[PDB]
Design a protein around this ligand. Structure first.
Ligand SMILES: *[C@@H]1O[C@H](CO[C@@H]2O[C@@H](C)[C@@H](O)[C@@H](O)[C@@H]2O)[C@@H](O[C@@H]2O[C@H](CO)[C@@H](O)[C@H](O)[C@H]2NC(C)=O)[C@H](O)[C@H]1NC(C)=O
Ligand SMILES: *[C@@H]1O[C@H](CO[C@@H]2O[C@@H](C)[C@@H](O)[C@@H](O)[C@@H]2O)[C@@H](O[C@@H]2O[C@H](CO)[C@@H](O)[C@H](O)[C@H]2NC(C)=O)[C@H](O)[C@H]1NC(C)=O
Ligand SMILES: COc1cc2c(cc1OC)C(=O)[C@H](CC1CCN(Cc3ccccc3)CC1)C2
Ligand SMILES: COc1cc2c(cc1OC)C(=O)[C@H](CC1CCN(Cc3ccccc3)CC1)C2
Lengths: 527, 527
C-alpha cells in the first residue's frame, strides 16, 4: 500500500487515491464523512458531527449528491447537463473532499475551501467543473470542497420551531469548516491560512459566513464570484419562509409546527423536490424557494444591515462577475426567449419580462426599471431590448449586490479586489447572444482547460494558468498580484477585466445602473 | 403730410412714422391703443375694447411699459439691464405696434404677431431686442406686437370672483389678436395668414391660445421659443392662486372677495410690486408669483390634459430651445453661483441647488432627480455638478415641456418643426460657463445684428438673415424650408441645430432626460 494515500483524521482512518494531471500526480481524498447522515428524524435538523469509526473509510470516489431538483429544460444539452447531479441522489450526502499535492506536503500548505453554487436548491462537489486536481498541482495548495444540503432539506424554515429552524445547509458548511480546522493538518494543510471561495449561491454562502461570528473564526480570506449575501434571491424573511414551508406541506398532503414537520419527515425526499418550485409566490426567474432565512440566529440582521454596520479591518476579499450575468436566466421564463433562436423580443415582451425578472414589486418600481433600461431613442429595437432585459436581471441579481458589498467593505476597512470576467469559452454550447453567461468563469479558475481530453485552445490554457495564479496568490497573501491589479475603492471603483488580453484597469461596476438599484430603488420601496 | 403714415382703423385715424433700415424704409405705428386703460376700478378686470376717437392719434413712439418688478441683480450690467423697462411704468399700458413695408403693401401680406416673455411678471414690446423693423424689411411681412399686463395686474386671481377672475393678461393678448383680425388689413396685412410667435412666457402664452377655443380662430400658425404652456412655472392651480393673492393682500394691509379686491385696488401699483416675490411658498428659481390660472374658463383644464386630448390636424408649429436653457437661472438663487466666478459648486451646493430648482416636491422626488443627474463615476466634480444643475433647471422648466408638447402635437395631426439654437452671440456679456442662455436667440430671429450701430460679426449678420428667412417661410407656408429641415415626430424625434454651420439634423430633445420628467416623475408624485 501507498503511505501517501493513508491518512488518520480525528474520526478514524482514510484511504485515498492518486490522480493523474498534465503536470504530475495529486492525492485525493473523496467522500470523507463529516456529519451523521441527516435522515429520518434528522431531516431538517442541524448537522451532527460524524461519530468515530473503526477500520478504514474508503475515500476513493465521490459520494452521493444531496437530494435536489434536476434541470429538465433542454434534455441532453451539455449546457444544462454539466450542472446536473452526476452521482445518485441521497439525503445521506454530507461528505467532503480533500486534494493535496503528491507526495503530501510536509510543511503547512495554504487551504482553499470551495462552496458550490446552484441557487441553494442544487449543486454538488462532484461536478466535473469543480475538479480540484489542477489547482492543487499547479499552485501547490490544499483544496477542500464539501456537499451541503439544498432546497427544502437545507433551508425549509418554520421560524421559532426547534424541528425546522432553517439554515441547516449553512450549518453543514460551518461544520465542514470546523472539520477543516481540526483535520486539514493531517493532509499538509495549514488551518491558519484558509481562503473561502464560491460562486453564485456559494459566493452568497461565503458572504454569510463573513457576517456570522461563529463562522468568521474558521477562515481568513474570502472570494465571492458572481454572488453576494445581499442578493435579492439569497435570503428570505421569516414570514415568507413560514408561508413557503406551510404551502409545501399542503401540496404534499400535510397535516402545531411539530405535527407539520413530523408529517413532512414521512414523505420521500423526491416528493418534496417535485413541488419545490410551486411555493414561489409569483412568476419569476432567478428566485429560489428555500434559501437562508433572516431570523436573528445565523444572521442577527439582514445581510445589507450587517454589511453597512461592520468593521472589516483585517479582511481581504476578492469579488467579481462575468460580463453577462443575466442572459442565462432569461430562457427559464422570460417571454420570447430561447437558446435556439436569437430571442429578438418585442417591447411588449420586454415589459412583461421586467415583471418576471423583478418579481413582487410595485407597479411604480417596475416603471422605474423600464425608465432606466429603455433607450428612448430606440424604445422598440429588439436587439437592444434583449440586451436590456439581460442587464436588468444581471444588475439586479448579481452586479449591483456585488458592487454594494465591495463598496461597503472597502469603505469600512477591507482590502477589496474586483474583476469582470470577459472571456467566452471556445467550448461554450450556449448561443452567442448570451455572451459570457453566469457560471462560465468557474472552469477557468479550476484550470479545467488543462485537461487534454477537452478541446480548449492553447491560449485558453495559458489564460487558465493566469487565473489559477491570481486566485492562489490571493489565498497565500491577500493580494492577487505577482500591469498591476489595484484595490477596488468606493471612490475610484477600479476593477480589472479578465480575458486573453493583458489586465486592463477600468472604473465602475456598472455604476450608473447600480446607483438606481442600491441608492434609489430601496427609497422608493419604503415610500 | 405723408400718406404712407396715415391709416384708418375701426376706432379712428392714426399717424405713424417712417423708419430707416439698412435695407430700406419701413412704416411703424407704435403705441396704438387697443383697450381702455385698466386703471382704478378697472384694475384686475378683463380688458375693455378701446372706445373710438375723433381726430388723429399719433402712433409715433412706444407707449409705457406695464407695471412690473425691475431686475436689480447686477445694477448697470447690460446682461440684466437689456430686459428691464425702457419706458416709464404705468398701468395705462395696453397698446400695440404694427410695422409694415414702405410703401404699404399692395397685396395682402402675412402677419407675424410677437408675444414677449418675462415669466409673466415683466417684459414689454418696446425692448430694443424686439425691434420689428428688420424682419419687415428683410422678409416683407407685417409685424405686430402688443403689451399685456404682467404680475399681479395681469394674473392675480381670486378664482370664482368677478372682481379678479385671473388671466386678464391673456385676455389682453386675445383682445390684441381680435384687433389684428379687424384692422391689420388696413396696413396691408392678411388676416387669414397670422402666425403667433413668442419666447419663454410668450411661448407659453402662444401655447395657451392654441388650447383656448376663442383664441384659436384668431391665428393659423404658432412658434414657441424656449417655453410651453405645460411648463411647471407657467400655470398655477386655483387654490394656490387664491393663497398667493390672499397673502399678497395680507402683506399690503388688506383684510369677502369684492372687499379684498377693492382694498387692493387702493394700493399704489408700486406697493403691490414691492411684495410680489414674497408670496412664493418656497425658495426657488424659475418660479413666478402670478401666472395663468387653470380656471375652467380660459383653460378648460390643465395644459397637459388639453394637449393630450386635442385634435391638431391642420396646425403647423415651430418649436425650439437654446443650448443651455438652465444656466441663466442659477445666478438668481442657487447656492454657489455667480456671473463673476466659474461657479464650480460642491456636491453639498448641488444637492441644495436641486431643491431650489425643483421646489415643493417630496424628498423622494428630489432623490430621483439626484439619481438621474449625478455621474456616479464623478459624483463630486464641480464642473460636472455645475452643468448638471443647469440641465436640471433647463430640462424641467423648458426642454422637456417643449418636447412633450412637440411629441403630442405631432402624434395628433400637427406638422411640427423643432430646433436647438447653438450660437453664442459675439456680443454676449454673460460668463462663458452659461453657454447659450435663455433668451439669447431672440436678437437673431429679429435681425438685430443688421443694425450697423451694433458690433456683430459679418457671419452673425448672415446667420440672422438665414433665421429670419426660416421664420418668415414658416409664417408664409407652414414650412421653414426654401440641407432640409425635416418635421419632428414622436418616433424619429428629428430637430436641427441652428448656428453658423449649415443645418445638422439630430434626434431626441434630451430624450433620456425627458423620459424621466415626462413619463416617470409624474407617476412618482401621484403615488
Ligand atoms: C423564440 O422561441 C420562443 C420559444 O419558443 C420555443 O422555441 C422555438 C425555437 C420554437 O421551437 C417554439 O415552438 C418553442 O416553443 C418563441 O416564443 C413562443 O411562441 C409560442 C407560439 O408562438 C408560444 O406558445 C410560447 O409561449 C412562446 N414562448 C415564450 C413566450 O417564452 C419566440 O417567438 C421565438 N422567436 C422567434 C420565432 O422569432
Ligand atoms: C462664486 O460666487 C458666489 C457668490 O458670491 C458673490 O460673488 C462673489 C464673486 C463674491 O464677491 C461673494 O462675496 C459674493 O457674495 C460665492 O458664494 C457666496 O459665498 C459667500 C461666502 O464667501 C456667502 O456668504 C454667500 O452667501 C455665497 N453666495 C451664494 C449665492 O451662495 C461662491 O463661493 C464663489 N465661488 C468661488 C469663489 O469659487
Ligand atoms: C424549473 O423551474 C425553474 C428553474 C430555474 C429557474 C427558474 C424556474 O422557474 C421559475 C432559474 O432561474 C434557474 C436558472 C439557473 C439554472 C442553473 N444554471 C447553471 C448554473 C448552475 C450553478 C451555478 C452557475 C450556473 C443557471 C440558470 C433554474
Ligand atoms: C427677485 O427675485 C427673483 C427674481 C427672478 C427669479 C427668481 C427670484 O427669486 C426667487 C428668476 O428665476 C428670474 C430670472 C430671470 C430674469 C430675466 N432674465 C432675462 C430674460 C427676460 C425675458 C426673457 C428671457 C430672459 C432671465 C432670468 C428673475
Amino acid at each position: 500500500e501507498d503511505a501517501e494515500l493513508l491518512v488518520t483524521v480525528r474520526g478514524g482512518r482514510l484511504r485515498g487515491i492518486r490522480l493523474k494531471t498534465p503536470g504530475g500526480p495529486v492525492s485525493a481524498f473523496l467522500g470523507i464523512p463529516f456529519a451523521e447522515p441527516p435522515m429520518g428524524p434528522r431531516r431538517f435538523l442541524p448537522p451532527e458531527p460524524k461519530q468515530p469509526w473503526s477500520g478504514v473509510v474508503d475515500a476513493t470516489t465521490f459520494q452521493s449528491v444531496c437530494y435536489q431538483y434536476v434541470d429538465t429544460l433542454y434534455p441532453g444539452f451539455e449546457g444544462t447537463e454539466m450542472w446536473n447531479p452526476n452521482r445518485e441522489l441521497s439525503e445521506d450526502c454530507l461528505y467532503l473532499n480533500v486534494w493535496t499535492p503528491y507526495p503530501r506536503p510536509t510543511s503547512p500548505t495554504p487551504v482553499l475551501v470551495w462552496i458550490y453554487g446552484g441557487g441553494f436548491y442544487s449543486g454538488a462537489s462532484s461536478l466535473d467543473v469543480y475538479d480540484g486536481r489542477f489547482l492543487v498541482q499547479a499552485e501547490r495548495t490544499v483544496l477542500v470542497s464539501m456537499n451541503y444540503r439544498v432546497g427544502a432539506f437545507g433551508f425549509l424554515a418554520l421560524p421559532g420551531s426547534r424541528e425546522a429552524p432553517g439554515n441547516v445547509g449553512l450549518l453543514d458548511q460551518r461544520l465542514a469548516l470546523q472539520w477543516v480546522q481540526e483535520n486539514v493538518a493531517a493532509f499538509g494543510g495549514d488551518p491558519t491560512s484558509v481562503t473561502l471561495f464560491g460562486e453564485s449561491a456559494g459566493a452568497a454562502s461565503v458572504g454569510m459566513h463573513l457576517l456570522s461570528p461563529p463562522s468568521r473564526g474558521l477562515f481568513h480570506r474570502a472570494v465571492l464570484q458572481s454572488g453576494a449575501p445581499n442578493g435579492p434571491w439569497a435570503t428570505v424573511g421569516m414570514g415568507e419562509a413560514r408561508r413557503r414551508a406551510t404551502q409545501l406541506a399542503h401540496l404534499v398532503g400535510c397535516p402545531n409546527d411539530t405535527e407539520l414537520v413530523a408529517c413532512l419527515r414521512t414523505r420521500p425526499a423526491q416528493v418534496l423536490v417535485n413541488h419545490e418550485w410551486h411555493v414561489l409566490p409569483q412568476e419569476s426567474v432567478f428566485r429560489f424557494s428555500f434559501v437562508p432565512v433572516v431570523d436573528g440566529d445565523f444572521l442577527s440582521d439582514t445581510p445589507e444591515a450587517l454589511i453597512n454596520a461592520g468593521d472589516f479591518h483585517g479582511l481581504q476579499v476578492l469579488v467579481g462577475v462575468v460580463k453577462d450575468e443575466g442572459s442565462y436566466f432569461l430562457v427559464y421564463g422570460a417571454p420570447g426567449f430561447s437558446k435556439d433562436n436569437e430571442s429578438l423580443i418585442s417591447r411588449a415582451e420586454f415589459l412583461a419580462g421586467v415583471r418576471v425578472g423583478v418579481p413582487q414589486v410595485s407597479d411604480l418600481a417596475a416603471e422605474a426599471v423600464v425608465l432606466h433600461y429603455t433607450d428612448w431613442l430606440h424604445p422598440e429595437d429588439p436587439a437592444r431590448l434583449r440586451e436590456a432585459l439581460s442587464d436588468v436581471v444581471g444588475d439586479h441579481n448579481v452586479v449591483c449586490p456585488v458592487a454594494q458589498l465591495a463598496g461597503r467593505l472597502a469603505a469600512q476597512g477591507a482590502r477589496v479586489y474586483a474583476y469582470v470576467f470577459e472571456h467566452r469559452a471556445s467550448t461554450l454550447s450556449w448561443p452567442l447572444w448570451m455572451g459570457v453567461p453566469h457560471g462560465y468563469e468557474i472552469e477557468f479558475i479550476f484550470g479545467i482547460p488543462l485537461d487534454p481530453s477537452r478541446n480548449y485552445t492553447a491560449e485558453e490554457k495559458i489564460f487558465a494558468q493566469r487565473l489559477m495564479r491570481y486566485w492562489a496568490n490571493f489565498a497565500r497573501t491577500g493580494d492577487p498580484n505577482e500591469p498591476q491589479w489595484p484595490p477596488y475603492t468606493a471612490g475610484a471603483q477600479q476593477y480589472v477585466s479578465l480575458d486573453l488580453r493583458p489586465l486592463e484597469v477600468r472604473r465602475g461596476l456598472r455604476a450608473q445602473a447600480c446607483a438606481f438599484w442600491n441608492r434609489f430603488l430601496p427609497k422608493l420601496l419604503s415610500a
